């Protein structure tokens, strides 16, 4: 209902966790499990690549279509670009339906 491609076998979930590292266990033995660990985090790059297939547009309509066009009027901030403080902002939602096929 939200949108997109209903799949029976979606791209599988990728779960990730830091392996816990204990911290300074006492010398004498105790059965209770460790309540204290090294405080640590991890970081690194992630690369996702998807190959899309397209349906080429083949039509005979005479007059020109509607297209998605960023307006040419001068403004303080360009759309879809960083501002002066570095905060990237999307100005408006972009639907996918512009080209016109006859019903």
């Amino acid at each position: 209902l939200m949108g997109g491609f209903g799949l029976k076998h979606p791209p599988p979930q990728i779960l990730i966790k830091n392996t816990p590292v204990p911290a300074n266990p006492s010398t004498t033995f105790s059965a209770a499990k460790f309540a204290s660990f090294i405080t640590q985090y991890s970081t690194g790059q992630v690369s996702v690549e998807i190959e899309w297939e397209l349906q080429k547009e083949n039509s005979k309509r005479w007059n020109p279509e509607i297209q998605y066009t960023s307006n040419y009027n001068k403004s303080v901030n360009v759309d879809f670009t960083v501002d002066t403080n570095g905060v990237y902002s999307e100005p408006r939602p972009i639907g996918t339906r512009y080209l016109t096929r006859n019903l």
Partner: protein, 104 residues
């Protein structure tokens, strides 16, 4: 060949192969008789301005000029070429005259 068999088929199409686009266009023309089949020189009437004098000949012949773009490109085919491409140049053309009929 003959009066009954037609000489050529109407081709008006635009195909976008990949790098190259092939634009075809077909029209129907009508050619009168100019100057009653005789040459004439023409020149500036009496006089008007020094700049506007001209001398030349007017032949009975007539010619085809497809030199404008919109002959070849439909407004939509123009929109595709214009929005998706940096540059375009022509490569080769072919010209065809068919189904001629003379009427008296």
């Amino acid at each position: 060949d003959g009066v009954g068999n037609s000489s050529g088929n109407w081709h008006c199409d635009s195909t976008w192969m990949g790098d190259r686009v092939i634009t075809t266009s077909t029209r129907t023309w009508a050619l009168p008789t100019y100057n009653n089949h005789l040459y004439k020189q023409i020149s500036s009437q009496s006089g008007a301005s020094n700049d506007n004098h001209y001398f030349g000949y007017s032949t009975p012949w007539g010619y085809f000029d497809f030199n404008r773009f919109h002959c070849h490109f439909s407004p939509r085919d123009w929109q595709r070429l214009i929005n998706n491409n940096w540059g375009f140049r022509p490569k080769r053309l072919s010209f065809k005259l068919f189904n001629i009929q003379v009427k008296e």
